[PDB]
Amino acid sequence: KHCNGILKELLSKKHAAYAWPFYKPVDASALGLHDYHDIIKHPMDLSTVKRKMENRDYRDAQEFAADVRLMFSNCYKYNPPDHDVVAMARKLQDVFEFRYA
Amino acid sequence: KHCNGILKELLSKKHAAYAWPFYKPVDASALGLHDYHDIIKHPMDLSTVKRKMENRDYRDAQEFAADVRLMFSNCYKYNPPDHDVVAMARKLQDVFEFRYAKMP
Amino acid sequence: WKGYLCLRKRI
C-alpha cells in the first residue's frame, strides 16, 4: 500500500506534463514505431501497473519497483538521449525513486 | 481483388525495411515539417489505402494504382532527391509497378 | 514521433 500511493502520485495531475507518455502502452502502430517490439522485449506502462495492482500481482515492493524501472529502461533504450520523452522519463523517475526510497 | 493481394505485399514484412515511411499518414507536427500541408494537397499512405480497400472505395484497379502512386508522388514532391525516404519510395514503387503490371 | 527509425523521416 506504500506502493499504491506511489502509483496514484505518478498518475495524478501533479506530473501530467511529463507523465503522459507512460499512461498507456506504447502504440507501435504510430508512424515510425513499428520496430518497438523488435527492440523492446518487455514493454511496461502505468496502466499495466495499475492493472497488476488491482488484480494484485505484485507480491512485495521489490516486484512493484522492478516494473516501474523497466518502463523507464525501455524509454531510455528505444528513444534518443536528447528526446523530450527521455527527459520526461528522467523527471518522472526521480519522483518515483524517492517515494520508494 | 488482385489489388488486395498487391496491398498485402506492400504491407508484408518482406518489404518492411523500406515500406514503413508509408504505413501511416504523415504527421507534419511530430517530424518538424509544418509546411508539409502547404505543399502536399492530397496526402496518402498505406493505412489509408487499406481503409479504402476494406470499405470498398476503389471502383477499379486504376483508382487503386492512382492512390498508391500519389503516396509516392508526395514523397518525390516534398523530399529532396537524395533523401532516405525517396530511396525507400523508389524501391517500394518498384515492387508495386511489378505486381500491378503482372495482373491478369 | 520518438523513435530512431523516425529520425530518417526528418529533413
Author numbering:
A (entry chain C): 351 to 451
B (entry chain A): 351 to 454
C (entry chain K): 1 to 11
Question: What does the paper behind this entry write?
Answer:
Within this class of proteins, the bromodomain and extraterminal domain (BET) family contains four members that are transcriptional coregulators and that recognize acetyllysines (AcKs) using a tandem pair of highly homologous bromodomains (BDs). Despite heavy academic and industry investment in this area, the generation of paralog-selective inhibitors has proved elusive because of the extremely high sequence similarity between the bromodomains of family members (90 to 95% within the acetyllysine-binding pocket residues). Using the highly conserved BET BDs as a model system, we conducted three mRNA display-based RaPID (random nonstandard peptides integrated discovery) screens using a single library (which contains >1012 unique members). Crystal structures of 13 distinct peptide–bromodomain complexes revealed highly diverse structures and binding modes among the cyclic peptide ligands.
In contrast, 4.2B and 4.2C are members of smaller families that are detected only in the BRD4-BD2 selection. In line with this observation, 4.2B and 4.2C showed significant selectivity for BD2 domains over BD1 domains. Its “primary” interaction has the 4.2C helix binding in the same location as the other helical peptides but its long axis is ∼30° offset from that of the others. However, the relatively small number of medium- and long-range NOEs suggests that the peptide exhibits significant conformational dynamics rather than a single well-defined conformation.
